[PDB]
Structure formats: structure tokens, C-alpha cells
Design a protein around this ligand. Structure first.
Ligand SMILES: CCCCCCCCCCC[C@H](O)CC(=O)SCCNC(=O)CCNC(=O)[C@H](O)C(C)(C)COP(=O)(O)O
Ligand code: SF4
Ligand code: SF4
Ligand code: FES
Ligand SMILES: [Zn+2]
Lengths: 118, 198, 114, 83, 47, 83, 687, 231
């Protein structure tokens, strides 16, 4: 038989994350925009949640960038806004969702460019 | 373009129906890839029953367990997708039975059905965190003795959170939070243009 | 809601298991400090056990608790059946790492991102 | 009690705020004319009941809730603030 | 190399060296990129 | 010093690295070595610099030497050609 | 009604009559490979790379230019429509110079990918290629035009989005080169967009010539702070220094475009930048010292000085979070002399109702306007992506633009009513001609620039405009949600400052000189040390050492909008969040914390210790700050007028003139801009 | 990646022509040593049913007499066009399996010979610039080839979304990759089935009531390479 729990699945205790990176890390759920350089829209389809950016100090010996934040390069991809919000809640990371913004329909017709008076 | 024989996509397809009919209480979906591979999908409760039927049925003997793995689709409510690939040396065919398990909803263990799984199930617990009831001895296999966190989860940082160095003061190896001298350069590679309808 | 029970039907039954594990660790701390020749005090170690057992005191859900002891039991096994040598155990004490202050002024004075 | 600022965080199109907004429409101008230096801030919250925040001297802020209050009660509460 | 000599290209070395690692001729790695964030130097003239 | 004017400041400590060691640099600098090669006076508006050696060179590109004032320079070799 | 049903591969999508074949595929979700078709640019049909095959039709049709018709099935992936792409891509590539490892639009090429996805694997062009002489079109765009696929999107943008009408096609045949016939530089704001809009890497950015390659660039989405339109932008950072800022689309604010200033002044962000906290030494020079010492220099003076002896002149690019941390601090020592450098008239209701100081007809409401009364501002150089708005709505719709300012280049046909603030009274009386024009307008909008307000009779100019808006509203009988009066700003931290109750103008500090002054990012000359009291103890809080630094007893370096999760708000009050693209440099710290820390070293210690808390703080003082991307609908214009009627002021005959008369005026304004080597190169090119 | 050098085949012949004697020698030293047999014979016997059950899948199965060579049962590449004999074993034990491994060394020389005798003239990589990188002469003279070279090296194949488990007969046993793949150029999962994770597990059920030296012999008869097991 099933048991009842109203407790938001929080599994922060099982994930195995250091305390500092669960209480000081804000992740943003956003649908990636399109670099204006290209006109393809296949990278503006799935929602992604990305952890907040952290220190990137220069390395003294070779000048390479060096980072102390483990969750930096991690960007998880989630198909829908609801599912991504769920991941933040059970993992205990703070979230600030940004609504998808899709190009509004625009009316175009080759005839217009040859308008008597535009 | 690879050569494809539809003899198999028909044979395997039929078998799929046969399995489904025989085990309708658990089989949810049964598909054959365009690569001629069958992939019965079963409710997690059907782990024991569906495997056993395949290990011990005259018309479908699937004696050895090729592999037990768990893809992790973070989006999917049931995060893990335990996949069991089996081989039938009698009928020279392989099938894959895949179930879904969430982080804290354990799956049954099949060590009974195939003892090959004794190790792979420990491997799935160590890397992904799925738990297997009735397992003889579930304990980390691949990770370090004191490792905290399940590594192959998509939500675990590659570099991880701890690294080891020898400290003279304490004359013993000592973890420290990871500090990397050239972070993994995360090249974005997806192109903004699709390839086909698929 | 409507969850399936892992091993403990309710926080009550689950807590029973935690009690057992605590006892286990409590009885074990002394042995480890001797079989590993660790340079720690049994009392000190036993407090650490308490620390950990409470670090996760907030969990209210029965399923999460049950896994926590499964995992906890596994750790004990690695320390009583000794597969975890000192380096592994002492790591719990975070002996070498320099503690970080949590005072705002302290962080301001040191790190760009607190 | 030195009064420096009064903030009326009304919430537009909210049932309770009706009184607050009515006050703004009918008496705001008057209050300002009377106190022509004091900064009375009309701001628009959301999904929050109105609040007449008041900042007294030396960085002390005080709160008077205006939820579901009539136009003159809002007027009376505002008048009580700048004593 | 005597029979068919190699192509000379007016940059190639004439004295090739062995491992210089223990000797002070050894490569010591260094970043070759110039400074990136130039800073506002204070004004030296007292205001 | 180096190709890019990489010279540790008089106070930088990476200079300790060079203490008792040679800071590796190359006398042969490209910015200068290309200059020596003379402008090729081709007699066709557009010529191609395959890079010298065909497959053993650089991707083939055609240069427009039409501008009378300036000379075409292969984005690859740096070789210059004028009509 | 008005819903034809067309099938895209039998999906029965339904589209308004007028939708093109390419558009029909988009709603199903398919994407026609396209070049020369941009959503906000006219359809041209030049490339013919979009040929698709409507079912039962002899020839394939041009997607981007074919009005869809009832019943048609698009057959986008039909064997035919693939030969129609496998054979076009053959041609574009045939005359193309293969210098893809030179073309810095390497991974940002809509022609390799559309070739790797929709084209063939080889080539059959055994013949020779062509080469086109390059052009020095400007100091920002590098036109290696041998790359050009003659797609004419530049010639469109340069005519349709921006009104330059300079770039054009020259010649016919395979030596049609799309470059200026005579070598005249393409000098205009909105110029850099050509880079982003040319899918080929023919003309690309000259500063970001070869510093990077796109796969490496980590892309953080943030907000434009150089101008008050608050254009959305993406800061591309590699290994921790910003490499490029390119636009990201916001339908309402910047729809895929950004100004020349806010994409080439990322270089200015990297020099003359403050990093360590220097203090004035006995000798009289600023000496770098640790925070602890620099902060207590300031804290000790703060404890000694009482209210109205401590003042703050903030201004420029400071975020809302610092602005509330500076007010909460100076009130905890009871001075409410917090002020901003840009003077907004505050004798009637100012700062109190939130419509006296906002462009409340939305940036997207310029599209549905009828007559715009530009009064005393050059939008072209004060809000370039709002000038574009009136550009599009004068072209695609029919806005009648009228300017009461200097006759100035506006990229559109305006009516120059005159250069006199009093003729505003002329229209209010109904005496001037355009009085009827407005009478004829069902949806009119006045726009009073902040720079007109910055003159001495600015209070009178606002009052005079409010009177005219009042009877314009009465005569037109315009509906209430249509809002005629709006005023646009040119300083990013002005709407936020006025929102938090900061009182505009340094007029209050002028009348009583503070013993102490916190210049929170102020590089303006609003008060000078000669003007200050003898002590002249002022501490600069900012990022670049420009005017406030050398006259500063303490330097507390801060960050810039590329380096903090602060909030800003543009002119119609849409609050927006900058995200940290790069960690702040040196010992430099986030602006809000420096002030929280100074407070803890002083004993009045601001209650907020984590950003999320500083924000919760913003919520108590103001609503917009916490709700992002959300314009505030209602406003109270009627009571604003009543107080305007009480105010009596004289509009002096001096003509109202925008400070940015021509584009050299525009390139260098704020601190980051001034510190730009690219902006400096642009300035000398004009001069 | 690149065609064989001009001359390799001839040398892979000289060697093959002789290697046999080398295997023969080892034999005269170990196959019948009065002592090799003892330490190996009847050590780690694994039943046929148990070998399939614990997923042994390798010589370990073949040594117990189960006939399964994925190379004959499920041919991959052109291992179908060659002719070889699987070396099945009886009385499976360390000695028998050994004999099997010496016999596949022998059978592989039979397969190598053929491959040298019948290798066709042709290209060594698919002609789809989409999947295989363009030849360097082509990428340096043809635009479509540079674009295909640039995209392939910088971004990738862009495999169509799907998942497959493909197993070959690696020398140790069945080596399989379960490669789940989204449409992206980088994989999503790639569980490597290691013939060896299963074999080690069997160490327990093989070395029972055995001496310390027996354990050493059994780790050898499983060809455990910790790279595949640990992955
Ligand atoms: C010296 C070596 C140090 C090693 C210490 C030790 O091995 C590590 C370890 O504690 S292993 C993890 C223990 N963690 C649990 O066993 C879960 C506890 N579960 C709860 O705490 C619940 O929240 C509960 C409702 C029971 C609160 O109730 P209560 O506060 O315990 O009474
Ligand atoms: S544009 Fe630049 S990148 Fe795109 S193909 Fe032509 S050269 Fe290669
Ligand atoms: S320049 Fe860029 S945009 Fe203008 S035509 Fe050539 S390619 Fe099309
Ligand atoms: S997009 Fe169809 S014509 Fe260029
Ligand atoms: Zn060259």
C-alpha cells in the first residue's frame, strides 16, 4: 500500500552536494535565445537551467583561466518549464524562471515593396 | 547506406507481440528500432516477471544478461531508465527490456533471474543511485570508499567536488574542494539548423 | 503525494532504524580509532557521528530517511569491515582544509562571489 | 516623529485596493498641495494587500496595512501618519 | 641525409640542441598574452 | 621581447621563473620574415595563392589585385601580389 | 474567418490569408533553409535557396515570397525540393572563397550549416573563382566582401531598419558587388547590426576580428545599460573577459537590434578600470590599500558627520540595488540629500506618481500611435532603438512625426514646428497649424526628452507640455488606456533612482554643501571640489576612473553591468536583470555589498546581507524592481495635471537643443563609452 | 582513417608466415609441461549452465563447450566472408580454455591469411562528407569540402536520435557499446559492456575451496584488463 507525504520531494540530502553549493547557488531556467549571427531556430527550442556564474581568475604560471566553482559548466536541458522547476525544488537550488519569448507573427508580402504610396 | 533486411524487423516485431501478449500486465510499449532491435518496455513491477519469462520460456530462451544500465533523463519524472539487454544463444537474438525508476523508488533486483546482474546492479546504484531490493550485497563498486554523490547522474559536475593531494603537515592524503587550473572549456556545439523531420 | 514506501511505512518506523544505526556507529567509533590508529578522540569521533546524524535531522519524508540509513549502513560496513583506511575516515573531520568564515564582512573582504 | 516619506503601495485591479486607489483619485492632489515638499510615493504592488509604508527620521520605517479599507479610513490613516 | 640532403628554409636551426632540461637553457613556461584589464593609474599630481 | 611584446614587468614575479633559466623566445619573428619576401608582380586581375605545394600548402584562395594602390595579401601566407 | 487551411505535409495548419509558404512551414515547426529572408526585413527572393514544392504543381515555389493558398501541400522535404537545394548550394559555394578559417563567422555561418544540412558533400566547380575588391566601409565593420552571396539584406536593413539608404547594388552579372559606389563610410547608429544580419562573414566586426571563435564563447543573457531603452543583449565571454555583446530578441524593447555604442564599448569596459581601493595619502596622492583601511577612512568620517552634511550624487550606470543600499545607509545617519545628476523637474508631483517620469505608451505603442510630438530631444542619439521604433511605424504604419527642437537628422520625415519652448503654448492655444493635425489624431503621443528638462526652465517645459497633453486628450477624446504624455530618459539609473524616491537634480546639495559626499558612480561635473566645503571629503564609488576619481579622498572600486546580478529599469518602467557574465576584476566588489559593508563598519548596518534580501528590500520601497519584464499599466495623469496647473513658470525664449546634435556627440557619453578605444577610433574617424 | 601504407600487407605476411612456429614453441614449453597441466587442469571449472547464467560470454563460455562466437552467429564487418573454426572446449578448466586461446591464435592466422589474399581495391572511408572528413586535397581546393571539414572537426556527425547495443567478439569476449544518442553531435550515454565485469564476478563462484596460488591462476584465465572492468 502507498503512503502519504505532502513534503515537496527534496532529496538534497541524498544528492551528495557540498552544503555551500546548495544554498548559495541560484540557477536560472531560460530558453536559449539565438545568437543573432545565425537565423536558425533549432537552439531556441528546449528549456535549459544554468547555475549562476562564479570566479574565473587568471592562472599565474600559464595565464589559463582557472575556476573554483564545480557547477559552472553544468547546464541541464529540460523539455518543459514545469519539469525544470521540479528539478530545482527537489535538488534544493533556488530558481528564477524566465518566460519563453517567441517572435510575434509578422505580416509580410512582396507586393508591399512596390506600393504606390508607402 | 547500410543494408537492412526486413526479415528481422518482421521476426522481431512478431516476437514483440508474442511477449506482449504473454506478459500484458507489465508490457507498456514494445518497439523495434529501424536497426532491427526489439525493446519491450515494462512497468517497474514487471522486472522479475518479464525477465523470468524470457530466461525460461521454450519459445524465447534469453539465457545471458549482456548489460544493465540506466540512462538518466533529468526531464523525465522517473529520472532513470534501467535498460536490460539480453541475449538468446538459442535463437541468436537480443532483446532489451527497459523500465523507469525515480531516485527514491527502488526497482526489484534480478540477481535471482540472472546472477550476472549482481555486479551491474551495484554499478547502477554507485553511479546513478537507483536502489535494488533483495540484492545480496549492494555497495559501491566503482567509486572511492568515501565518495559522496552518484557520479553518472546528469546533475553531477564532471570534475566533481573533491580532489586529492598529499599534505606534509598531516602526512596523509587529504580531500580539498576541487580547484582546477584550466576549467573544462565548454564548447557549445549544437547548430541552430535541424537535419530532417525526425 | 501517493508515494510507495521503500522500507519504512512512516517516519515513525523509519526513526527506529536510525536509532539502530546510531547505536551501531556509536559502538564502532572506538574500534575504528584503534584499528586505524587514527589520531582522534573517541569522544570527539562520537560527536562527529552525532553531527552527521543530525545534519540530516530536517528530513520529514519516510522514503528519504530509509535510503539515508541504507547509505549510512553501507558506510559503516566500509569502516568496520575495513576497506576504508585512515585517509578515508579522517576526511570526515576535514582536518587539513582551512575553514571559511560565514560573516558577511569576512566574505566581502575575501571573495568576489559569496 | 520626523516624517521623511510615505509609501502607498496600492495594488491595481485588486479588490481590496479599491479604497486606496479611490483615495488617490480624490484626495491625493489635496494632500500634496498641503504638504508640498514631503514625497508621497504612489507605487503599484501585486498579489500583496496595500501597505502605507512610512519612513520616519533616522532610517526607521513603519507599516500600516490598507487591505479592504474605505476611502476615508485611508484618508484618516494617512492624516494620522503626518501628525 | 648525405645522399639526399634536407630542404633548407632560412629559418631552420644550424645548431640543434639536446635535452636542456637539467641545464639552465630549459623551457620555463610563461603566458605570452599581454595584459587584459588595464587599470586607472591614480593622478600623481596632488589635487 | 616575444612576438607579441610579451615582457614581464620589472616587478612581476613570474620573472622568478626565468631566474637561473632561459626564457624561451625565437629570434625569427614572422611579422618581419614575411616582409622580406617581395611583392609578386602578377599580370592578371585575380590570381590564386594555393599556399605553395598544393596539398602540402594552404586552402586555395583567389586574390583581387584590382586596387591599383594596394597589393593583395593572402590571408594565409601573407604573401603579397600586385598587378 | 480569415483562416485558410493549408497543409504542410498534410498537417492542416490554418493561417491568416497573406501568410507566405515559409511562414506556413514555421507554425507546423519545419524551417525552410533561407538566405535573404529576415523576419523584420522586406522579402526579396534574391537567393532562391527556399524553393519548395507545393503539391500537384509543375514548378517549385519561393517560400518566403509566395502567398499561401487554400489546400496547398508544401512537400518541403520532397525529393524535388532537395534537388532544388542541392543545386542552389552548388552555386552559392561555387564563387565562394574558401577562407572559412579566416571567416570569423566560422561556426556562426548560415551557409556552411545550411550546406552541411541541406546541401551536397562535394563540388563540381572545376572552373575558376571570382574576387571582389574589399572596401573600407568604416572603422567598425570589416567588409571582406569577396564573401558576399548578394543576398541584399544589408541594402534592406540599411534602408528599411536604419534610414541610411547608402549601401546599394552596383553592376549586373557575376560582378554585382553590394558596396558603396564611392567610398563614403557607413556612419550611422544601428550600423553594427549589418554584421549580425549578413549571414555570410563578408562584412564582420573589426574590433572583434580574430579574438575568438563562437563555439568557445560562453553566452550570458543580460541588459543594455549604455542607453535607457534597456535593450536586451547577450554578453559572449571566453575564459573570463567579455569578447562580444550581440543582440538577443525582445519583441517590445530591442527586437533583434542594439546600438553602435552598446556593442563596441565592451572594449572601454577593460581599461582605466578601478580595481583596488586606494586612499588619499598624507603626501596627497591616491595610495592602493586594503578594504578594511579604505572602508574605515569612510566609516569614521560618516560617524563624525550628521544628516545634511553627508550627501550622495549618484548617476549614470549604478544599479537599483546599490541605489537602495546608499539611501538606507544615508538615512541611518538621517540625510535624505540622496540625488541624481540628471535634473527631472520635481515641483509638481514628480517622483510621486510614476507617470510624470516614464514613457508609459510602450516602446511597442509607438507602433499603434497616430501623431508623435517629439519635443526637445534627438531620439536618433538619445534612444537609438526607439528612434527605430518611430522609423518602422512611419514606414510600415503611418505615424505623422513632429519635432519642437533643433531641425535635426531624424532618419525620417518629421515636421519641424520650430525651435522655441513657448510655441508649445502656441499648440495649447490651438494657434499653431499642427493643433488640428492632432485634433485629427485618434491615438496621439507627446514625448518630452529628459535633456530639454535639464535646462533651467525644465519645470516650466514639463508644465507647458502637460497643459497641451490635457486638451489634446480632451479634443481627441482619446480613450484612457491610450496615454498621450510620456518622457524618455538617456541615463540608465534615472528611472530606478526616481522610483526608489531619490530626488532628481543636485539642486539641494548646491544650496547646503555636505561635509561628505558619496559619489556613487558619478563622473558628471554636477558639483566639483571647489564647490564643496573646505573639507571636501568625498569618496568615489564606481568602476572607471574618469572625473570623480582624481578628486576623491577615497576610492572604493565597484563593478559594471557585465559583472553583477543587478537590476535596471528602462523608460516605461520595465525592470530588467543583468546577470554576471564575468566575475568583477581585482579586489573590486559588487556595488550593493561595498555599501552593506561600509554600514557594518559604521554601526548602522543595512538589514540585507544576500542579494535576494536586497531585492526583498527593493520590494518594500518600490514594486517594479521585483517583477521583471512587466510594464506597470495604470497611471494617474489627471492629478498630475492639477499640480502642474498650480505650478507657474516661464519658458525662456532660448531654443531647446538636444546635446547630441550630430553622431560624434553620440559615440562618447558615459564612463565605459569614454574609456573605449573603439569609440575613440570612431570619434576621430568622424572628426 | 588512412589506407594501408604501400607495403604493409607484404610484411603482415612475412610475420604471419612465421608466427606459427612461435606459437608452436610456446607449446613445446607449456601445453604438455608436466607442471603447467597440474596448476591449470581442473582449476576453476565452470559448468555450461552457470557460465551463461553469470554472463561470461567469451572463451570462458566457449571453454565450457557452449558454442557461441558472435563472429559466426552474428557476423559484423566481413567476418562473414572469411572461414575459421571456433575452438570449442570440453572439460572446461584453466588448461582447456588456455588451449582454446592458443587455438584462436592459430585460427586468427587463418583469417589474416585470407584477408591478405582477398582485400579489395577501393576507398577506406565512406564517401559521405556528412560522416567522413573530406580528403585534404579536396578541402584545400573545393568550398563544399572545406565547409564539411570545418563543421565535422569543430561540431560533429550529428547522429540521428536513437539507441543501439552492438557487440563484437573482442579478444576477451563480448564487447558491446549501448550508445543512446539524441540528435546532437555529442552522445547522451555510452555504457561499455566489458567482457571482464562479468568474468571477475565469477571469480567467487570459480575459486571456491582453492589455494592462494589457484586464485592467481584464475585471474589469468579471465584475461582481466582493469581498464574495461573499471571504465
Ligand atoms: C568518526 C567517523 C565519523 C563517521 C560518522 C558516521 O559514520 C556518518 C553518519 O552519521 S551516516 C548518516 C546518518 N544519517 C541518518 O542516519 C539519517 C538520519 N535521519 C534523520 O535524522 C531524520 O531527520 C529524523 C526524522 C530521524 C530526525 O530524527 P532525529 O533528530 O535523528 O532524532
Ligand atoms: S562565410 Fe565565412 S564561414 Fe561561412 S562559409 Fe563563407 S567563409 Fe566559410
Ligand atoms: S553583405 Fe552580407 S548582407 Fe549585404 S549582401 Fe553581401 S551578404 Fe547579403
Ligand atoms: S529566402 Fe526564399 S528567396 Fe531567399
Ligand atoms: Zn598565400
Amino acid at each position: 500500500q502507498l503512503i502519504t507525504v505532502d513534503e515537496k520531494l527534496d532529496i538534497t540530502t541524498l544528492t551528495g552536494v557540498p552544503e555551500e553549493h546548495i544554498k548559495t547557488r541560484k540557477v536560472r531556467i531560460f530558453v536559449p535565445a539565438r545568437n543573432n549571427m545565425q537565423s536558425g531556430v533549432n537552439n531556441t527550442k528546449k528549456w535549459k537551467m544554468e547555475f549562476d556564474t562564479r570566479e574565473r581568475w587568471e592562472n599565474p604560471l600559464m595565464g589559463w583561466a582557472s575556476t573554483a566553482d564545480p557547477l559552472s559548466n553544468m547546464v541541464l536541458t529540460f523539455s518543459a518549464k514545469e519539469d525544470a522547476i521540479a528539478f530545482a525544488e527537489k535538488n534544493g537550488w533556488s530558481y528564477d524562471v524566465e518566460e519563453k519569448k517567441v517572435p510575434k507573427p509578422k505580416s509580410k508580402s512582396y507586393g508591399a515593396n512596390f506600393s504606390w504610396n508607402k | 547506406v547500410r543494408p537492412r533486411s526486413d526479415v528481422t524487423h518482421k521476426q522481431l516485431s512478431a516476437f514483440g507481440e508474442y511477449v506482449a501478449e504473454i506478459l500484458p500486465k507489465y508490457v507498456q510499449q514494445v518497439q523495434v528500432s529501424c536497426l532491427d532491435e526489439l525493446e519491450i518496455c515494462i512497468h517497474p513491477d514487471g522486472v522479475i516477471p518479464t525477465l523470468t519469462f524470457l530466461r525460461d520460456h521454450t519459445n524465447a530462451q534469453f539465457k545471458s544478461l549482456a548489460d544493465l544500465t540506466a540512462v538518466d533523463v533529468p526531464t523525465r519524472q522517473n529520472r532513470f531508465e534501467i535498460v536490460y539487454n539480453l541475449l538468446s544463444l538459442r535463437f541468436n537474438s537480443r532483446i532489451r527490456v527497459k523500465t523507469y525508476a525515480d531516485e527514491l523508488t527502488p526497482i526489484d533486483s534480478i540477481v535471482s533471474v540472472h546472477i550476472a546482474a549482481n555486479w551491474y546492479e551495484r554499478e547502477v546504484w554507485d553511479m546513478f543511485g537507483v536502489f535494488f531490493f533483495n540484492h545480496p550485497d549492494l555497495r559501491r563498486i566503482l567509486t572511492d570508499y568515501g565518495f559522496e554523490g552518484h557520479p553518472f547522474r546528469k546533475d553531477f559536475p564532471l570534475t566533481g567536488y573533491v580532489e586529492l593531494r598529499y599534505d606534509d603537515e598531516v602526512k596523509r592524503v587529504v580531500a580539498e574542494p576541487v580547484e582546477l587550473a584550466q576549467e573544462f572549456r565548454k564548447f557549445d556545439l549544437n547548430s541552430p539548423w535541424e537535419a530532417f523531420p525526425a | 503525494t501517493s508515494v510507495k514506501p521503500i522500507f519504512s511505512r512512516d517516519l515513525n518506523e523509519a526513526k527506529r532504524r536510525v536509532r539502530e544505526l546510531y547505536r551501531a556507529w556509536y559502538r564502532e567509533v572506538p574500534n575504528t580509532v584503534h584499528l586505524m590508529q587514527l589520531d582522534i578522540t573517541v569522544k570527539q569521533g562520537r560527536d562527529k557521528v552525532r553531527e552527521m546524524f543530525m545534519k540530516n535531522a530536517h528530513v520529514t519524508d519516510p522514503r528519504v530517511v530509509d535510503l539515508l540509513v541504507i547509505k549510512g549502513k553501507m558506510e559503516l560496513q566500509e569502516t568496520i569491515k575495513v576497506w576504508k583506511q585512515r585517509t578515508h575516515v579522517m576526511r570526515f573531520f576535514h582536518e587539513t582544509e582551512t575553514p571559511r568564515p560565514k560573516d558577511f564582512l569576512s566574505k566581502f573582504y575575501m571573495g568576489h562571489d559569496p | 516623529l520626523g516624517l521623511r516619506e510615505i509609501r502607498v503601495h496600492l495594488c491595481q485591479r485588486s479588490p481590496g485596493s479599491q479604497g486606496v486607489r479611490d483615495f488617490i483619485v480624490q484626495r491625493y492632489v489635496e494632500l500634496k498641495k498641503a504638504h508640498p515638499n514631503l514625497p508621497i510615493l504612489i507605487r503599484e504592488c501585486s498579489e500583496v494587500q496595500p501597505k502605507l509604508w512610512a519612513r520616519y527620521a533616522f532610517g526607521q520605517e513603519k507599516t500600516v496595512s490598507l487591505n479592504n479599507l474605505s476611502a476615508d479610513e485611508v484618508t484618516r490613516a494617512m492624516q494620522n501618519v503626518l501628525s | 641525409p648525405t645522399t639526399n640532403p634536407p630542404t633548407a628554409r632560412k629559418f631552420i636551426w644550424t645548431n640543434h640542441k639536446f635535452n636542456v632540461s637539467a641545464t639552465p637553457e630549459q623551457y620555463v613556461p610563461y603566458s605570452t598574452t599581454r595584459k587584459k584589464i588595464h587599470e586607472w593609474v591614480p593622478p600623481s599630481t596632488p589635487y | 621581447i616575444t612576438h607579441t611584446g610579451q615582457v614581464y614587468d620589472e616587478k612581476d614575479y613570474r620573472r622568478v621563473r626565468f631566474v637561473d633559466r632561459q626564457k624561451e623566445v625565437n629570434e625569427n619573428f614572422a611579422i618581419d620574415l614575411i616582409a622580406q619576401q617581395p611583392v609578386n608582380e602578377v599580370e592578371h586581375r585575380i590570381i590564386a595563392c594555393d599556399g605553395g605545394g598544393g596539398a602540402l600548402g594552404h586552402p586555395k584562395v583567389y586574390i583581387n589585385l584590382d586596387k591599383e594602390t594596394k597589393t593583395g595579401t593572402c590571408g594565409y601566407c601573407g604573401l603579397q601580389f600586385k598587378q | 474567418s480569415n483562416l485558410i487551411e493549408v497543409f504542410v505535409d498534410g498537417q492542416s495548419v490554418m493561417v491568416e490569408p497573406g501568410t507566405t509558404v515559409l511562414q506556413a512551414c514555421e507554425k507546423v515547426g519545419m524551417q525552410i533553409p533561407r538566405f535573404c529572408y529576415h523576419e523584420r526585413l522586406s522579402v526579396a527572393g534574391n537567393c532562391r535557396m527556399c524553393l519548395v514544392e507545393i503539391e500537384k504543381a509543375p514548378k517549385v515555389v519561393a517560400a518566403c515570397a509566395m502567398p499561401v493558398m487554400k489546400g496547398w501541400n508544401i512537400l518541403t522535404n520532397s525529393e524535388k525540393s532537395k534537388k532544388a537545394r542541392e543545386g542552389v548550394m552548388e552555386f552559392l559555394l561555387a564563387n565562394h572563397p574558401l577562407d572559412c578559417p579566416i571567416c570569423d563567422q566560422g561556426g556562426e555561418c548560415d551557409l556552411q550549416d545550411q550546406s552541411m544540412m541541406f546541401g551536397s558533400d562535394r563540388s563540381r566547380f572545376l572552373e575558376g573563382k571570382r574576387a571582389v575588391e574589399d572596401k573600407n566601409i568604416g572603422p567598425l565593420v570589416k567588409t571582406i566582401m569577396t564573401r558576399c552571396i548578394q543576398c541584399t539584406r544589408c541594402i534592406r536593413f540599411a534602408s528599411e531598419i536604419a534610414g541610411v539608404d547608402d549601401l546599394g547594388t552596383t553592376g549586373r552579372g557575376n560582378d554585382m558587388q553590394v558596396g558603396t559606389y564611392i567610398e563614403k563610410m557607413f556612419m550611422s547608429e544601428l550600423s553594427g547590426n549589418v554584421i549580425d544580419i549578413c549571414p555570410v562573414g563578408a562584412l564582420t566586426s573589426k574590433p572583434y576580428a580574430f579574438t575568438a571563435r563562437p563555439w568557445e564563447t560562453r553566452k550570458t543573457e543580460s541588459i543594455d545599460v549604455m542607453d535607457a531603452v534597456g535593450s536586451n543583449i547577450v554578453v559572449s565571454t571566453r575564459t573570463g573577459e567579455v569578447m562580444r555583446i550581440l543582440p538577443r530578441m525582445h519583441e517590445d524593447i530591442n527586437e533583434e537590434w542594439i546600438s553602435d555604442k552598446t556593442r563596441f564599448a565592451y572594449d572601454g569596459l577593460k581599461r582605466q578600470r578601478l580595481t583596488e581601493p586606494m586612499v588619499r595619502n598624507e603626501k596627497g596622492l591616491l595610495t592602493y590599500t586594503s578594504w578594511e583601511d579604505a572602508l574605515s577612512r569612510v566609516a569614521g568620517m560618516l560617524q563624525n558627520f550628521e544628516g545634511n552634511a553627508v550627501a550622495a550624487i549618484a548617476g549614470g550606470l549604478v544599479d537599483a540595488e546599490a541605489l537602495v543600499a546608499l539611501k538606507d545607509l544615508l538615512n541611518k545617519v538621517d540625510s535624505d540629500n540622496l540625488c541624481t545628476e540628471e535634473i527631472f523637474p520635481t515641483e509638481g508631483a514628480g517622483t510621486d506618481l510614476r507617470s510624470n517620469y516614464l514613457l508609459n505608451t510602450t516602446i511597442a505603442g509607438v507602433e499603434e500611435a497616430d501623431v508623435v510630438l517629439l519635443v526637445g530631444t534627438n531620439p536618433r542619439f538619445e534612444a537609438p532603438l526607439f528612434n527605430a521604433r518611430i522609423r518602422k511605424s512611419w514606414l510600415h504604419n503611418d505615424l505623422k512625426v513632429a519635432l519642437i527642437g533643433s531641425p535635426v537628422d531624424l532618419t525620417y520625415r518629421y515636421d519641424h514646428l520650430g525651435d522655441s519652448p513657448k510655441i508649445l503654448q502656441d499648440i495649447a492655444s490651438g494657434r499653431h497649424s499642427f493643433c488640428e493635425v492632432l485634433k485629427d489624431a485618434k491615438k496621439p503621443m507627446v514625448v518630452l526628452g529628459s535633456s530639454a528638462l535639464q535646462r533651467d526652465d525644465g519645470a516650466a517645459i514639463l508644465v507647458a507640455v502637460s497643459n497641451m497633453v490635457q486638451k489634446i486628450r480632451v479634443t481627441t477624446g482619446v480613450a484612457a488606456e491610450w496615454k498621450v504624455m510620456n518622457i524618455l530618459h538617456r541615463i540608465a539609473s534615472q528611472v530606478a533612482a526616481l522610483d526608489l524616491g531619490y530626488k532628481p537634480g543636485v539642486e539641494a546639495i548646491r544650496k547646503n554643501p555636505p561635509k561628505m559626499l558619496f559619489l556613487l558612480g558619478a563622473d558628471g561635473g554636477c558639483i566639483t571640489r571647489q564647490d564643496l566645503p573646505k573639507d571636501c571629503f568625498i569618496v568615489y564609488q564606481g568602476h572607471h576612473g574618469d572625473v570623480g576619481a582624481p578628486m576623491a579622498d577615497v576610492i572604493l572600486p565597484g563593478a559594471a553591468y557585465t559583472e553583477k546580478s543587478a537590476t535596471y529599469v528602462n523608460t516605461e518602467g520595465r525592470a530588467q536583470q543583468t546577470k554576471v557574465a564575468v566575475t568583477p576584476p581585482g579586489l573590486a566588489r559588487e556595488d550593493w555589498k561595498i555599501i552593506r559593508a561600509l554600514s557594518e563598519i559604521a554601526g548602522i548596518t543595512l538589514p540585507y546581507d544576500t542579494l535576494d534580501q536586497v531585492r526583498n528590500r527593493l520590494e518594500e520601497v518600490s514594486p517594479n524592481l521585483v517583477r521583471y519584464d512587466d510594464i506597470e499599466e495604470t497611471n494617474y495623469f489627471q492629478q498630475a495635471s492639477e499640480l502642474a496647473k498650480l505650478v507657474n513658470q516661464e519658458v525662456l525664449a532660448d531654443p531647446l537643443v538636444p546635446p547630441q546634435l550630430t553622431i560624434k556627440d553620440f559615440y562618447m557619453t558615459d564612463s565605459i563609452s569614454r574609456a573605449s578605444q573603439t569609440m575613440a577610433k570612431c570619434v576621430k574617424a568622424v572628426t | 582513417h588512412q589506407d594501408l601504407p604501400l607495403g604493409l600487407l607484404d610484411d603482415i605476411y612475412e610475420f604471419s608466415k612465421n608466427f606459427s612456429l612461435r606459437i608452436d614453441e610456446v607449446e613445446e614449453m607449456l601445453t604438455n609441461n608436466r607442471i603447467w597441466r597440474n596448476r591449470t587442469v581442473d582449476i576453476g571449472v565452470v559448468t555450461a549452465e552457470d557460465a551463461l547464467n553469470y554472463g561470461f560470454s567469451g572463451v570462458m563460455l566457449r571453454g565450457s563447450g557452449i558454442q557461441w562466437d558472435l563472429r559466426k552467429t552474428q557476423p559484423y564487418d566481413v567476418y562473414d566472408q572469411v572461414e575459421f573454426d571456433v575452438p570449442i572446449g570440453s572439460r572446461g578448466d584453466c588448461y582447456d580454455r588456455y588451449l582454446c586461446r592458443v587455438e584462436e591464435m592459430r585460427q586468427s592466422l587463418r583469417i589474416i591469411e585470407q584477408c591478405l589474399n582477398k582485400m579489395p581495391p577501393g576507398e577506406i572511408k565512406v564517401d559521405d562528407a556528412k560522416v567522413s572528413p573530406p580528403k585534404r586535397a579536396e578541402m584545400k581546393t573545393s568550398m563544399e569540402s572545406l565547409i564539411h571539414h570545418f563543421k565535422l572537426y569543430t561540431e560533429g556527425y550529428q547522429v540521428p536520435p536513437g539507441a543501439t547495443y552492438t557487440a563484437i567478439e573482442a579478444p576477451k569476449g563480448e564487447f558491446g557499446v549501448y550508445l543512446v544518442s539524441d540528435g546532437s553531435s555529442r552522445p547522451y550515454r555510452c555504457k561499455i559492456k566489458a567482457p571482464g565485469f562479468a568474468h571477475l564476478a565469477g571469480l567467487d563462484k570459480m575459486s571456491k575451496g582453492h589455494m592462494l596460488a589457484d586464485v592467481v591462476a584464475i585471474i589469468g584465465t579471465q584475461d582481466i584488463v582493469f581498464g574495461e572492468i573499471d571504465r
